[PDB]
Amino acid sequence: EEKAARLFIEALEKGDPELMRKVISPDTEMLDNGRTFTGDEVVEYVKEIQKRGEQWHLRRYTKRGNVWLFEVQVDTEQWYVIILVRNGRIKLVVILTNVDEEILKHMMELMQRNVPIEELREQLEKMLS
Ligand SMILES: [Cl-]
Ligand SMILES: [Cl-]
Ligand SMILES: [Cl-]
């Protein structure tokens, strides 16, 4: 479970779609500051990082329940990658940039309760406007 989560970040870190492909599933859902990605689209996200050449640096992390919060510096912006793992598999990912700690805590709470991606997205939208 820890490995799943960490490898996901390392894929971002390293710009490695091949690695991402290993730990996601067709059911994986991701929200990147509002926009939605399902399954193999998460892999394409990593291609965009690599085929752009800005460096993602995993700085530090926390586990809360089944939710991991990774604090990434992007070359600096504070990016946050929040991950719900379930059964060896990444279920939900939220990526945010330069948001308040309250938003991170609120999103983590929603994810802990296995809220659908629709609710996660609407909740973000209400908070960022
Ligand atoms: Cl999609
Ligand atoms: Cl809150
Ligand atoms: Cl809240």
Side-chain angles (χ1 to χ4, degrees):
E1 281 187 359
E2 301 198 359
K3 185 79 176 307
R6 184 50 179 280
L7 292 192
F8 178 110
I9 296 290
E10 294 302 317
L12 303 176
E13 196 165 312
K14 305 293 187 284
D16 190 336
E18 201 49 70
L19 178 58
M20 183 63 81
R21 200 174 286 109
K22 295 195 183 294
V23 311
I24 62 99
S25 97
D27 286 352
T28 302
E29 288 176 323
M30 176 169 85
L31 192 67
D32 176 17
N33 292 270
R35 186 268 170 84
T36 305
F37 307 73
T38 298
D40 313 65
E41 290 173 358
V42 173
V43 178
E44 289 301 304
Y45 190 84
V46 181
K47 286 190 180 190
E48 279 231 349
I49 298 308
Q50 167 207 59
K51 294 179 179 179
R52 293 182 183 174
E54 292 177 350
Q55 63 201 38
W56 283 46
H57 288 303
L58 176 54
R59 290 310 187 186
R60 69 183 184 234
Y61 62 90
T62 299
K63 173 195 169 55
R64 292 292 191 248
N66 296 285
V67 176
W68 297 76
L69 171 67
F70 297 98
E71 168 175 300
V72 168
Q73 280 182 337
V74 171
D75 191 3
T76 71
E77 296 180 357
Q78 301 292 142
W79 292 62
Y80 301 88
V81 176
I82 319 184
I83 291 169
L84 176 64
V85 188
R86 292 182 183 174
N87 302 310
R89 293 182 183 174
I90 295 181
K91 197 219 167 214
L92 285 174
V93 179
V94 168
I95 303 186
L96 297 172
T97 311
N98 293 356
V99 295
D100 196 66
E101 75 279 343
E102 178 178 23
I103 291 180
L104 300 171
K105 296 302 180 288
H106 187 93
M107 297 305 293
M108 288 180 80
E109 290 172 350
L110 292 176
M111 286 170 85
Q112 260 286 101
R113 303 182 312 105
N114 202 40
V115 155
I117 205 72
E118 297 88 323
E119 185 62 5
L120 287 183
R121 179 166 74 231
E122 203 76 357
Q123 287 286 121
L124 269 183
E125 286 178 12
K126 286 174 205 288
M127 286 193 308
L128 308 174
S129 44

Short mmCIF file of all heavy atoms in Angstrom, two decimals, residues 2-47:
data_model
loop_
_atom_site.label_atom_id
_atom_site.label_comp_id
_atom_site.label_asym_id
_atom_site.label_seq_id
_atom_site.Cartn_x
_atom_site.Cartn_y
_atom_site.Cartn_z
N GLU A 2 1.85 1.28 0.93
CA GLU A 2 2.85 2.33 0.97
C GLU A 2 3.65 2.40 -0.33
O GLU A 2 3.91 3.49 -0.84
CB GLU A 2 3.80 2.12 2.14
CG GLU A 2 3.11 2.10 3.49
CD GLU A 2 4.04 2.31 4.67
OE1 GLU A 2 5.26 2.47 4.43
OE2 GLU A 2 3.55 2.34 5.83
N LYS A 3 4.01 1.22 -0.86
CA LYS A 3 4.79 1.11 -2.08
C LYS A 3 4.01 1.65 -3.29
O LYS A 3 4.56 2.41 -4.09
CB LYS A 3 5.20 -0.36 -2.30
CG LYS A 3 6.14 -0.62 -3.49
CD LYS A 3 7.60 -0.28 -3.20
CE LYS A 3 8.53 -0.62 -4.35
NZ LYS A 3 8.38 -2.04 -4.79
N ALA A 4 2.74 1.24 -3.40
CA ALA A 4 1.85 1.75 -4.43
C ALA A 4 1.91 3.27 -4.44
O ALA A 4 2.23 3.89 -5.46
CB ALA A 4 0.40 1.27 -4.20
N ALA A 5 1.65 3.86 -3.26
CA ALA A 5 1.56 5.31 -3.12
C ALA A 5 2.86 6.03 -3.47
O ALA A 5 2.88 7.07 -4.14
CB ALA A 5 1.17 5.64 -1.70
N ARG A 6 3.96 5.46 -3.00
CA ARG A 6 5.27 6.07 -3.16
C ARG A 6 5.74 6.00 -4.61
O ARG A 6 6.27 6.96 -5.14
CB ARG A 6 6.25 5.35 -2.23
CG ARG A 6 7.68 5.96 -2.20
CD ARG A 6 7.68 7.48 -1.97
NE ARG A 6 9.04 8.02 -1.91
CZ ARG A 6 9.83 7.96 -0.85
NH1 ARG A 6 9.40 7.47 0.29
NH2 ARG A 6 11.07 8.44 -0.94
N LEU A 7 5.53 4.83 -5.23
CA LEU A 7 5.87 4.61 -6.62
C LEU A 7 5.11 5.56 -7.54
O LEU A 7 5.65 6.00 -8.55
CB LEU A 7 5.58 3.16 -7.03
CG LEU A 7 6.49 2.09 -6.38
CD1 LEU A 7 6.31 0.78 -7.06
CD2 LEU A 7 7.93 2.51 -6.40
N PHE A 8 3.86 5.87 -7.17
CA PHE A 8 3.07 6.82 -7.93
C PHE A 8 3.84 8.15 -7.95
O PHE A 8 3.98 8.75 -9.01
CB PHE A 8 1.64 6.93 -7.33
CG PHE A 8 0.72 7.93 -8.01
CD1 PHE A 8 -0.35 7.50 -8.77
CD2 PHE A 8 0.93 9.29 -7.87
CE1 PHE A 8 -1.19 8.43 -9.40
CE2 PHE A 8 0.08 10.21 -8.49
CZ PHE A 8 -0.96 9.77 -9.26
N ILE A 9 4.34 8.59 -6.79
CA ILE A 9 5.03 9.87 -6.69
C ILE A 9 6.37 9.86 -7.40
O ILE A 9 6.76 10.85 -8.02
CB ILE A 9 5.24 10.31 -5.22
CG1 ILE A 9 3.95 10.54 -4.57
CG2 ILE A 9 6.15 11.56 -5.12
CD1 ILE A 9 3.17 11.85 -5.14
N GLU A 10 7.07 8.74 -7.28
CA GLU A 10 8.36 8.57 -7.91
C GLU A 10 8.19 8.66 -9.42
O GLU A 10 9.05 9.20 -10.11
CB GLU A 10 8.96 7.25 -7.51
CG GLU A 10 9.32 7.17 -6.03
CD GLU A 10 10.30 8.22 -5.53
OE1 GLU A 10 11.30 8.49 -6.23
OE2 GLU A 10 10.09 8.73 -4.40
N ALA A 11 7.07 8.12 -9.92
CA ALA A 11 6.75 8.24 -11.34
C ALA A 11 6.69 9.73 -11.70
O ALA A 11 7.38 10.17 -12.62
CB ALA A 11 5.45 7.52 -11.66
N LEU A 12 5.94 10.52 -10.93
CA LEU A 12 5.95 11.97 -11.12
C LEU A 12 7.37 12.54 -11.03
O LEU A 12 7.84 13.20 -11.96
CB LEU A 12 5.04 12.65 -10.11
CG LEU A 12 3.57 12.17 -10.15
CD1 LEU A 12 2.79 12.80 -9.08
CD2 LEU A 12 2.94 12.44 -11.49
N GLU A 13 8.05 12.25 -9.91
CA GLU A 13 9.42 12.69 -9.64
C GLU A 13 10.35 12.45 -10.83
O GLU A 13 11.05 13.36 -11.28
CB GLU A 13 9.95 11.92 -8.40
CG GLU A 13 11.20 12.45 -7.68
CD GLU A 13 11.36 11.83 -6.30
OE1 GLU A 13 10.34 11.83 -5.59
OE2 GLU A 13 12.44 11.35 -5.90
N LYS A 14 10.31 11.22 -11.35
CA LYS A 14 11.22 10.77 -12.39
C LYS A 14 10.71 11.02 -13.81
O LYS A 14 11.44 10.78 -14.76
CB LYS A 14 11.46 9.25 -12.23
CG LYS A 14 11.94 8.81 -10.84
CD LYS A 14 13.35 9.30 -10.51
CE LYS A 14 13.88 8.71 -9.22
NZ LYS A 14 13.27 9.36 -8.02
N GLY A 15 9.45 11.45 -13.95
CA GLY A 15 8.84 11.56 -15.27
C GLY A 15 8.79 10.22 -16.02
O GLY A 15 9.24 10.12 -17.16
N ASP A 16 8.22 9.21 -15.35
CA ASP A 16 8.29 7.82 -15.79
C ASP A 16 6.89 7.25 -15.97
O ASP A 16 6.31 6.74 -15.02
CB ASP A 16 9.05 7.02 -14.73
CG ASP A 16 9.45 5.61 -15.07
OD1 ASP A 16 8.79 5.00 -15.95
OD2 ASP A 16 10.45 5.12 -14.50
N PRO A 17 6.27 7.35 -17.18
CA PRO A 17 4.91 6.84 -17.37
C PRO A 17 4.87 5.32 -17.20
O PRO A 17 3.88 4.75 -16.75
CB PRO A 17 4.55 7.25 -18.82
CG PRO A 17 5.68 8.14 -19.30
CD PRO A 17 6.86 7.92 -18.40
N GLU A 18 5.96 4.68 -17.57
CA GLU A 18 6.05 3.25 -17.45
C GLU A 18 5.85 2.82 -16.00
O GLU A 18 5.10 1.89 -15.72
CB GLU A 18 7.39 2.84 -18.05
CG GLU A 18 7.45 1.42 -18.45
CD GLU A 18 6.31 0.91 -19.30
OE1 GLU A 18 6.20 1.31 -20.48
OE2 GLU A 18 5.48 0.14 -18.75
N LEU A 19 6.48 3.54 -15.06
CA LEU A 19 6.29 3.24 -13.65
C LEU A 19 4.87 3.51 -13.15
O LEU A 19 4.29 2.71 -12.41
CB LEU A 19 7.30 4.06 -12.83
CG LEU A 19 7.22 3.92 -11.33
CD1 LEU A 19 7.42 2.46 -10.91
CD2 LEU A 19 8.27 4.79 -10.66
N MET A 20 4.30 4.64 -13.58
CA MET A 20 2.93 4.95 -13.23
C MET A 20 2.00 3.83 -13.69
O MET A 20 1.11 3.40 -12.95
CB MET A 20 2.50 6.27 -13.89
CG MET A 20 1.09 6.69 -13.50
SD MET A 20 1.00 7.00 -11.72
CE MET A 20 1.68 8.61 -11.70
N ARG A 21 2.22 3.36 -14.92
CA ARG A 21 1.36 2.35 -15.52
C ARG A 21 1.24 1.15 -14.57
O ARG A 21 0.17 0.57 -14.45
CB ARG A 21 1.90 1.92 -16.91
CG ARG A 21 0.86 1.27 -17.79
CD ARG A 21 1.34 0.98 -19.23
NE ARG A 21 1.42 2.18 -20.06
CZ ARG A 21 2.56 2.74 -20.47
NH1 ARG A 21 3.74 2.24 -20.15
NH2 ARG A 21 2.51 3.84 -21.22
N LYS A 22 2.33 0.83 -13.87
CA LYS A 22 2.37 -0.32 -12.98
C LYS A 22 1.44 -0.25 -11.77
O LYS A 22 0.93 -1.28 -11.34
CB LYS A 22 3.81 -0.56 -12.50
CG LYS A 22 4.77 -0.95 -13.62
CD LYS A 22 6.11 -1.54 -13.10
CE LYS A 22 7.10 -1.87 -14.19
NZ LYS A 22 6.62 -2.98 -15.08
N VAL A 23 1.21 0.95 -11.21
CA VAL A 23 0.51 1.06 -9.94
C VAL A 23 -0.91 1.62 -10.06
O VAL A 23 -1.65 1.63 -9.08
CB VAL A 23 1.35 1.89 -8.93
CG1 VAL A 23 2.80 1.40 -8.89
CG2 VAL A 23 1.31 3.37 -9.23
N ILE A 24 -1.29 2.08 -11.26
CA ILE A 24 -2.66 2.55 -11.49
C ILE A 24 -3.49 1.40 -12.03
O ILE A 24 -2.96 0.35 -12.39
CB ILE A 24 -2.73 3.76 -12.43
CG1 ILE A 24 -2.17 3.46 -13.84
CG2 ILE A 24 -2.05 4.96 -11.78
CD1 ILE A 24 -3.17 3.18 -14.84
N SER A 25 -4.80 1.61 -12.07
CA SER A 25 -5.72 0.64 -12.64
C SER A 25 -6.68 1.40 -13.54
O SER A 25 -6.71 2.63 -13.48
CB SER A 25 -6.44 -0.11 -11.53
OG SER A 25 -7.72 0.45 -11.28
N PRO A 26 -7.50 0.70 -14.36
CA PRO A 26 -8.45 1.39 -15.24
C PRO A 26 -9.45 2.23 -14.45
O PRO A 26 -9.97 3.21 -14.98
CB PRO A 26 -9.13 0.27 -16.03
CG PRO A 26 -8.84 -1.00 -15.26
CD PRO A 26 -7.57 -0.76 -14.46
N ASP A 27 -9.69 1.86 -13.19
CA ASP A 27 -10.56 2.61 -12.30
C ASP A 27 -9.94 3.81 -11.59
O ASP A 27 -10.65 4.48 -10.85
CB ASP A 27 -11.11 1.69 -11.20
CG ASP A 27 -12.16 0.73 -11.65
OD1 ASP A 27 -12.61 0.83 -12.82
OD2 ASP A 27 -12.51 -0.17 -10.85
N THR A 28 -8.63 4.02 -11.72
CA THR A 28 -7.99 5.13 -11.02
C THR A 28 -8.60 6.45 -11.49
O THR A 28 -8.78 6.65 -12.69
CB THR A 28 -6.49 5.15 -11.20
OG1 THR A 28 -5.96 3.91 -10.74
CG2 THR A 28 -5.84 6.29 -10.43
N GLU A 29 -8.92 7.33 -10.55
CA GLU A 29 -9.42 8.65 -10.91
C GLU A 29 -8.56 9.74 -10.30
O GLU A 29 -8.19 9.65 -9.13
CB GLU A 29 -10.84 8.80 -10.46
CG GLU A 29 -11.78 7.98 -11.30
CD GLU A 29 -13.19 8.06 -10.78
OE1 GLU A 29 -13.32 8.10 -9.53
OE2 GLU A 29 -14.14 8.10 -11.59
N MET A 30 -8.28 10.78 -11.10
CA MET A 30 -7.43 11.88 -10.67
C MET A 30 -8.03 13.23 -11.05
O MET A 30 -8.55 13.40 -12.16
CB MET A 30 -6.02 11.74 -11.24
CG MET A 30 -5.10 12.93 -10.89
SD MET A 30 -3.39 12.54 -11.33
CE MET A 30 -3.41 12.99 -12.96
N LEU A 31 -7.97 14.15 -10.09
CA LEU A 31 -8.34 15.54 -10.27
C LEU A 31 -7.07 16.38 -10.10
O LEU A 31 -6.45 16.34 -9.04
CB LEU A 31 -9.37 15.84 -9.20
CG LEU A 31 -10.15 17.10 -9.28
CD1 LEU A 31 -11.07 17.11 -10.49
CD2 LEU A 31 -10.94 17.29 -8.01
N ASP A 32 -6.68 17.09 -11.17
CA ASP A 32 -5.56 18.01 -11.15
C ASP A 32 -6.11 19.43 -11.18
O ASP A 32 -6.58 19.89 -12.23
CB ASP A 32 -4.62 17.80 -12.34
CG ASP A 32 -3.46 18.80 -12.43
OD1 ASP A 32 -3.16 19.47 -11.42
OD2 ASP A 32 -2.88 18.93 -13.52
N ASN A 33 -6.02 20.10 -10.01
CA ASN A 33 -6.60 21.42 -9.78
C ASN A 33 -7.87 21.64 -10.60
O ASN A 33 -8.03 22.69 -11.22
CB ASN A 33 -5.57 22.55 -10.09
CG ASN A 33 -4.38 22.64 -9.13
OD1 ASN A 33 -4.41 23.36 -8.09
ND2 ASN A 33 -3.28 21.97 -9.51
N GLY A 34 -8.77 20.65 -10.61
CA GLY A 34 -10.08 20.81 -11.23
C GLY A 34 -10.43 19.90 -12.40
O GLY A 34 -11.60 19.53 -12.55
N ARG A 35 -9.44 19.58 -13.26
CA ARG A 35 -9.64 18.70 -14.41
C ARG A 35 -9.50 17.22 -14.06
O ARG A 35 -8.68 16.88 -13.23
CB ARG A 35 -8.61 19.06 -15.46
CG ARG A 35 -8.79 18.32 -16.78
CD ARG A 35 -7.99 17.04 -16.83
NE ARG A 35 -8.32 16.18 -17.96
CZ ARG A 35 -7.81 16.31 -19.18
NH1 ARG A 35 -7.51 17.49 -19.69
NH2 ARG A 35 -7.62 15.21 -19.92
N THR A 36 -10.26 16.34 -14.75
CA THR A 36 -10.38 14.93 -14.41
C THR A 36 -9.65 13.97 -15.35
O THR A 36 -9.62 14.20 -16.55
CB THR A 36 -11.85 14.51 -14.42
OG1 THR A 36 -12.55 15.38 -13.55
CG2 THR A 36 -12.06 13.05 -13.97
N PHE A 37 -9.05 12.92 -14.77
CA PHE A 37 -8.30 11.91 -15.49
C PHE A 37 -8.70 10.53 -14.97
O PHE A 37 -8.82 10.33 -13.76
CB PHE A 37 -6.77 12.05 -15.31
CG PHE A 37 -6.17 13.39 -15.62
CD1 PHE A 37 -6.34 14.46 -14.77
CD2 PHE A 37 -5.40 13.58 -16.76
CE1 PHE A 37 -5.77 15.70 -15.05
CE2 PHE A 37 -4.85 14.82 -17.05
CZ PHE A 37 -5.04 15.87 -16.18
N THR A 38 -8.92 9.59 -15.89
CA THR A 38 -9.32 8.24 -15.53
C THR A 38 -8.36 7.24 -16.15
O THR A 38 -8.05 7.34 -17.33
CB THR A 38 -10.73 7.94 -16.03
OG1 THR A 38 -11.62 8.85 -15.40
CG2 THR A 38 -11.14 6.49 -15.76
N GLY A 39 -7.93 6.26 -15.34
CA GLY A 39 -7.13 5.16 -15.85
C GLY A 39 -5.85 5.64 -16.55
O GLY A 39 -5.07 6.36 -15.95
N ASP A 40 -5.70 5.29 -17.83
CA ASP A 40 -4.44 5.45 -18.54
C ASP A 40 -4.13 6.92 -18.86
O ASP A 40 -3.01 7.26 -19.22
CB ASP A 40 -4.42 4.61 -19.83
CG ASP A 40 -4.91 3.20 -19.62
OD1 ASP A 40 -6.10 3.02 -19.28
OD2 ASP A 40 -4.09 2.26 -19.77
N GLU A 41 -5.12 7.79 -18.66
CA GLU A 41 -4.88 9.21 -18.78
C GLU A 41 -3.92 9.76 -17.72
O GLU A 41 -3.30 10.80 -17.92
CB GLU A 41 -6.20 9.93 -18.64
CG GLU A 41 -7.09 9.70 -19.83
CD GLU A 41 -8.45 10.28 -19.58
OE1 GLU A 41 -8.68 10.81 -18.46
OE2 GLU A 41 -9.28 10.22 -20.51
N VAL A 42 -3.82 9.06 -16.58
CA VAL A 42 -2.90 9.43 -15.52
C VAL A 42 -1.46 9.25 -16.01
O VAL A 42 -0.58 10.02 -15.68
CB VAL A 42 -3.19 8.59 -14.26
CG1 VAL A 42 -2.13 8.82 -13.17
CG2 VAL A 42 -4.59 8.90 -13.74
N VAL A 43 -1.26 8.21 -16.83
CA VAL A 43 0.02 7.94 -17.44
C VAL A 43 0.42 9.07 -18.39
O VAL A 43 1.58 9.47 -18.41
CB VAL A 43 -0.05 6.56 -18.15
CG1 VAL A 43 1.25 6.21 -18.86
CG2 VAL A 43 -0.45 5.47 -17.16
N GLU A 44 -0.55 9.58 -19.16
CA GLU A 44 -0.32 10.65 -20.11
C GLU A 44 0.07 11.95 -19.41
O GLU A 44 0.78 12.79 -19.95
CB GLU A 44 -1.57 10.89 -20.99
CG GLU A 44 -1.86 9.79 -22.01
CD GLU A 44 -0.75 9.53 -23.01
OE1 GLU A 44 -0.34 10.49 -23.71
OE2 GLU A 44 -0.30 8.37 -23.11
N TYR A 45 -0.44 12.11 -18.19
CA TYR A 45 -0.08 13.21 -17.32
C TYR A 45 1.43 13.21 -17.08
O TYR A 45 2.08 14.26 -17.13
CB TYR A 45 -0.87 13.05 -16.04
CG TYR A 45 -0.81 14.24 -15.13
CD1 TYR A 45 -1.66 15.33 -15.30
CD2 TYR A 45 0.11 14.28 -14.08
CE1 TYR A 45 -1.60 16.43 -14.46
CE2 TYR A 45 0.17 15.38 -13.22
CZ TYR A 45 -0.69 16.45 -13.41
OH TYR A 45 -0.63 17.51 -12.55
N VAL A 46 1.98 12.02 -16.85
CA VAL A 46 3.40 11.87 -16.57
C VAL A 46 4.22 12.15 -17.82
O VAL A 46 5.32 12.70 -17.73
CB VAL A 46 3.69 10.46 -15.99
CG1 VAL A 46 5.17 10.30 -15.66
CG2 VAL A 46 2.82 10.17 -14.78
N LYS A 47 3.70 11.77 -18.99
CA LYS A 47 4.36 12.09 -20.25
C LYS A 47 4.47 13.60 -20.43
O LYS A 47 5.51 14.10 -20.87
CB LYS A 47 3.65 11.40 -21.42
CG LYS A 47 3.93 9.91 -21.45
CD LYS A 47 3.45 9.19 -22.70
CE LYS A 47 3.77 7.72 -22.62
NZ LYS A 47 3.54 7.03 -23.91
#
